[PDB]
Every structure is written in C-alpha cells, then in structure tokens.
C-alpha cells in the first residue's frame, strides 16, 4: 500500500517575505497496478486548490513517487493554521489523512553561543567549531556557518532537542582544517528564528 | 582594468597549488609543489572590496560553498569585485607564456609570478584573453623588469 509523508516548509521560506514557503505531501509507495493518486488539500478544514502535483516518478524499487506541493502564506503558517493532505487510492482501504501545523506557543528567542575547539582536539589535522543555539520556541529554526560572507560547506546540525523547560536547543558543528583555525580567521554562526529581531542573529568566533 | 587584481603571499599561492592538478613545464624552473589548474570539483573565489581589510581568497564548492580560506590579503593593487572560477597558472603572464599555454584562460582566474614584465602588462595580457581575475605572487628568486 502507499504511505504518506507530509513535510513543513523551510524556516527561511516562512521567515523571509522575499522567499516562498510550501508544504510537501510525499507519497512513498505507488502500486504498478493502481498508479492513480488523488490529492486533496485543506487549510483549517477549508479545501483549497492552489497546489501543484509534480510528475510521478518510478523509483529504484519498482514504486512510483508522487509529490504534491502547496504554497502557504507566511503569516498563515506562523499563526498556526493546520494543513491537511488527503491521499486517495484504490490500493488504500480508506484515504490517508496527514496534518501539519506550526507549534502554537509564545515565541522564545534563541540564545546563540560559539565554542572553540577542545585543547585535546588540536592533536588532529581537523577541528570542530561548535554553535550552541538554545532556549527557543517553536522548533522552527535555520542555522548556517560562514566566513567572509561565504557559507561553509563542511558543517552539520543536530535536529532540535526538547529541553526541560519546554524550549528547544541544538548544536551546529563546523569542521575546518586546524591550520585555518590557528591562523586567526573568523567563523560566524548565523541563526534565523521568528523571535529574533529581523528573524536573524550572528555570533563570531576566532583565535584569542 | 575591468578585472580584479590581487597580490598574494608565497604561502597563499602554495596553498592554492595544494588544490590544483597538472605539473608545470620543466621549462619554468619552478618548485615541485607548483600546479597548473584547479581540479574539476573546486574553483577559487576572489573578493576585492573598498575595505582592503576584507579582501579574501577562498576555495569553493561547485555550490559556491566554502572549502578553504586561503588568505585575507593586506596589500592592494592601485576593480572592486567578487569573481568565482577555475584558477590557471600562466607563469610570468607574458604574451609568450600565454600563447604556449595548454589550458585556455577564457572565463578563468589567472595566477602569475611577479617577474619579467610589469603588473599592468600581465593584467592586460590576461584581460586580453578574457581572464576574470588575476593573482600575483612573489617567489623569492627575482627577475627584474626590463624597460
Ligand atoms: C523505494 O525507494 C525510496 C527511496 O530510497 C523509498 O521512499 C522512502 O520511503 C520511506 C518509508 O519506507 C520514507 O521514510 C520516512 O522519511 C521521513 C523523512 O524523509 C525525509 O528525509 C529523508 C532522508 O534524507 C529524505 O530522503 C526525504 O525526502 C525527506 O527529506 C526531506 O524532504 C523534504 C521534502 O522533500 C524537504 O523539505 C526536506 O528538506 C528533506 N530532508 C532532507 C534530509 O533533505 C521520516 O521523517 C520518516 O520518519 C517518521 O516516520 C517513521 C514511520 O515511517 C517513524 O519511524 C519515525 O519516528 C518518524 O516518525 C515521525 O516522528 C516525527 C517527529 O517530529 C513526527 O513529526 C511524525 O508524526 C512521525 N510520523 C510518522 C508517520 O511516524 C520516515 O523515515 C522515506 O523518506 C522515503 N524516501 C527516502 C529517500 O527514503 C521507498 O519507500 C522505497 N521502497 C520501499 C520498499 O521502501
């Protein structure tokens, strides 16, 4: 049987009015016998027809992957409207409903702190620069590392983790060659969050 | 001079060579470490800014993403611009060096040794072949300009 996965829009897309945020309804398994998929979109229970179905595409495991994309309004998403995706198939016993929305709470501003490498980590040819982003709500957040106005390729970010106070935190780890760190270059952690002034803050870090 | 030109240290050059492929002609009596062109997967990005503080030479991902900070040149050559491309060695950037050159300069950043001819000439020769930027380094061995 088909399986349905509803995804939220990218934080930056929802935060920046210059950008276009959209919800993605993904259909993972589509039968060869019954390829037909009907998509029905709903916003706060009201059906809309603004969405576009991407072309169906055969995967490496003889299963079609149908995706439907619905563009959402920035403040509709930020206010906490629910988006329901209804998938109908003859291969389905009943049509599948998935719902996503923004977490409805008081926004809390993220605290952003950068940490330098451990003295023990300088033994290695490569070192990690750490970016602690904590005490934020909701979970919606965008984190980039950069140097001299250029984004860093070599960095990875843990998913948000629920803290004890109902807030979220996470870590971002930029990996650089040690020599680049020792030469006193500046690395910056960029953080976008709705609670921030201009949905943006930046923390820099370098050799003392 | 519609293209940026920038001076780099011998160290920054060698770091750039570290990310290049090809061996130099025996004819240029260079070091072992010298290389001709950047590997497919990397390009250099050069930024010359009204703030000479934030000049930068960086090696970039096909995605324009950062791989290596190579330098922040303190000096300047007497165009403020940011350019991304392949880096190609052209020795002294003589018209001759250029005409002998295996890899074509068009659309690429050029790196040359300070040497036989003026900076002004090197830039013009390169600009003449549609290079998008010029790096210049001093190897210790010295080749006084003739006039
Ligand atoms: C044939 O081959 C296909 C490809 O290899 C394959 O398709 C795959 O099908 C599986 C199911 O078998 C499906 O699994 C789910 O994936 C969810 C996340 O997918 C993300 O990340 C993956 C990994 O990189 C990407 O491949 C996906 O495209 C998607 O990436 C995101 O895509 C969106 C839009 O494209 C972008 O906007 C994002 O930026 C992008 N991310 C990235 C990385 O680029 C995953 O979350 C699912 O986990 C949840 O459900 C599971 C139950 O199935 C639970 O085990 C698990 O706990 C999770 O539960 C959820 O928990 C959440 C916590 O907040 C709650 O919010 C949810 O309520 C709760 N939901 C549910 C329903 O439990 C899960 O792993 C694959 O994604 C899909 N695609 C790929 C590439 O694998 C076919 O299935 C293959 N055939 C066969 C025989 O399997």
């Amino acid at each position: 049987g088909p399986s349905v996965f509803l995804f939220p829009p990218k934080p930056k897309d929802t935060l920046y009015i210059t950008r276009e945020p959209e919800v993605t309804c993904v259909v993972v398994d589509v039968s060869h016998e019954d390829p037909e998929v009907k998509f029905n979109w709903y916003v706060d229970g009201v059906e809309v027809h603004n969405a576009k179905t991407k072309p169906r595409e055969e995967q490496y495991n003889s299963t079609y992957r149908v995706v439907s994309v619905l563009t959402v309004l920035h403040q509709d998403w930020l206010n906490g409207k629910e988006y329901k995706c209804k998938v109908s198939n003859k291969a389905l016993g009943a049509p599948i409903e998935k719902t996503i929305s923004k977490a409805k709470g008081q926004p809390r501003e993220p605290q952003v702190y950068t940490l330098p490498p451990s003295r023990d980590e300088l033994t290695k040819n490569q070192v990690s620069l750490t970016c602690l982003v904590k005490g934020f709500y909701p979970s919606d957040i965008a984190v980039e590392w950069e140097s001299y106005g250029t984004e860093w390729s070599s960095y990875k970010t843990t998913p948000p983790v629920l803290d004890s106070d109902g807030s979220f935190f996470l870590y971002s780890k930029l990996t650089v060659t040690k020599s680049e760190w020792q030469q006193g270059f500046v690395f910056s952690c960029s953080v976008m969050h709705e609670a921030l002034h201009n949905h943006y803050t930046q923390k820099s870090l370098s050799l003392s | 001079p519609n293209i940026p030109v920038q001076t780099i240290s011998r160290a920054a050059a060698e770091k750039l060579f570290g990310n290049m492929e090809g061996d130099c002609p025996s004819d240029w009596k260079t070091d072992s470490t010298c290389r001709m062109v950047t590997s497919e997967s990397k390009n250099v990005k050069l930024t010359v800014s009204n703030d000479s503080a934030q000049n930068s030479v960086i090696i970039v991902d096909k995605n324009g993403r950062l791989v290596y900070l190579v330098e922040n040149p303190g000096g300047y050559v007497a165009k403020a611009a940011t350019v991304t491309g392949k880096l190609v060695h052209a020795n002294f950037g003589t018209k001759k060096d250029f005409e002998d050159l295996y890899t074509p300069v068009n659309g690429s950043i050029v790196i040359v040794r300070a040497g036989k001819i003026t900076f002004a000439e090197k830039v013009a020769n390169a600009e003449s072949l549609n290079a998008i930027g010029v790096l210049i380094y001093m190897d210790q061995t010295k080749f006084p300009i003739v006039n």
Side-chain angles (χ1 to χ4, degrees), chain A residues 1-27 29 31 34-51 53-57 59-63 65-74 76-83 85 87-89 91-118 120-208, chain B residues 1-13 15-25 27-39 41 43-50 52-53 55-78 80-95 97-98 101-120 122-139 141-147:
Chain A
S3 307
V4 175
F5 289 99
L6 190 46
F7 302 143
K10 285 148 190 130
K12 287 170 50 132
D13 295 353
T14 70
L15 290 177
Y16 285 103
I17 189 61
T18 31
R19 316 209 59 162
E20 191 181 46
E22 354 149 321
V23 165
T24 282
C25 203
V26 158
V27 183
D29 285 323
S31 92
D34 234 55
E36 215 256 306
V37 282
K38 205 206 177 75
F39 285 111
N40 301 76
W41 292 92
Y42 304 90
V43 180
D44 263 4
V46 172
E47 199 200 326
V48 302
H49 320 77
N50 322 128
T53 284
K54 311 202 63 46
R56 108 176 144 204
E57 40 166 68
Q59 297 271 320
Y60 177 80
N61 58 41
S62 306
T63 62
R65 191 166 144 290
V66 193
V67 184
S68 197
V69 176
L70 169 68
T71 63
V72 319
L73 263 46
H74 288 87
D76 288 22
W77 168 267
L78 279 172
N79 276 348
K81 296 256 235 273
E82 280 190 6
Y83 299 81
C85 182
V87 172
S88 313
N89 201 196
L92 264 49
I96 277 146
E97 276 187 8
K98 283 283 159 45
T99 326
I100 184 70
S101 65
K102 182 190 108 61
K104 282 136 203 117
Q106 168 76 62
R108 288 283 139 187
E109 162 215 276
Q111 316 301 284
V112 177
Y113 310 101
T114 48
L115 302 69
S118 165
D120 295 66
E121 179 160 38
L122 299 167
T123 312
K124 309 293 184 191
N125 263 53
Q126 291 176 0
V127 303
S128 337
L129 310 191
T130 321
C131 184
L132 196 167
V133 179
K134 82 205 205 82
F136 59 93
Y137 189 104
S139 151
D140 288 31
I141 192 143
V143 170
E144 296 174 39
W145 280 94
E146 58 164 80
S147 279
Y148 307 98
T150 303
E151 179 176 328
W152 275 106
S153 93
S154 52
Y155 74 75
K156 294 216 178 321
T157 286
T158 75
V161 179
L162 177 51
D163 230 326
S164 102
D165 72 342
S167 79
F168 290 88
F169 78 100
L170 69 82
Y171 281 95
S172 191
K173 188 175 61 54
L174 170 69
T175 300
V176 284
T177 178
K178 178 175 184 200
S179 90
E180 297 178 301
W181 167 250
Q182 305 238 281
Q183 279 184 232
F185 296 125
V186 77
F187 318 92
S188 319
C189 196
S190 299
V191 172
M192 291 145 252
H193 190 68
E194 67 174 279
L196 286 176
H197 179 254
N198 312 126
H199 305 340
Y200 185 93
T201 214
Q202 188 172 280
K203 277 292 151 312
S204 312
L205 148 64
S206 38
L207 203 64
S208 260
Chain B
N2 280 58
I3 61 184
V5 153
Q6 183 66 213
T7 55
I8 69 182
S9 61
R10 176 67 208 181
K15 300 186 233 183
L16 282 159
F17 300 137
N19 299 84
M20 287 160 140
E21 163 110 31
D23 254 286
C24 295
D27 184 336
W28 318 345
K29 302 192 81 67
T30 180
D31 305 70
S32 55
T33 67
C34 90
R35 295 293 178 273
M36 293 300 324
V37 295
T38 62
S39 330
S41 77
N43 301 332
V44 63
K45 167 178 217 181
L46 158 67
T47 303
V48 178
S49 58
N50 239 36
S52 293
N55 302 317
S56 88
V57 206
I58 74 189
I59 295 170
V60 186
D61 204 38
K62 304 314 303 189
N63 288 341
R65 296 273 165 63
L66 224 178
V67 160
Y68 205 120
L69 300 170
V70 162
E71 212 172 45
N72 289 319
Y76 79 79
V77 162
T82 315
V83 288
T84 263
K86 207 192 319 196
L87 196 43
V88 202
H89 204 175
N91 198 12
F92 289 120
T94 57
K95 301 203 165 309
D97 270 307
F98 273 108
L101 191 22
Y102 188 70
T103 321
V105 152
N106 70 288
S108 312
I109 314 193
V110 162
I111 181 182
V112 294
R113 303 197 253 183
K116 308 285 165 45
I117 72 192
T118 58
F119 285 18
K122 304 175 194 278
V123 194
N125 306 341
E127 198 163 18
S128 101
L129 279 108
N130 284 30
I132 61 160
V134 163
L135 308 192
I136 307 184
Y137 70 97
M138 313 217 70
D139 44 54
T141 307
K142 291 216 321 312
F143 309 80
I145 312 162
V146 55
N147 34 342

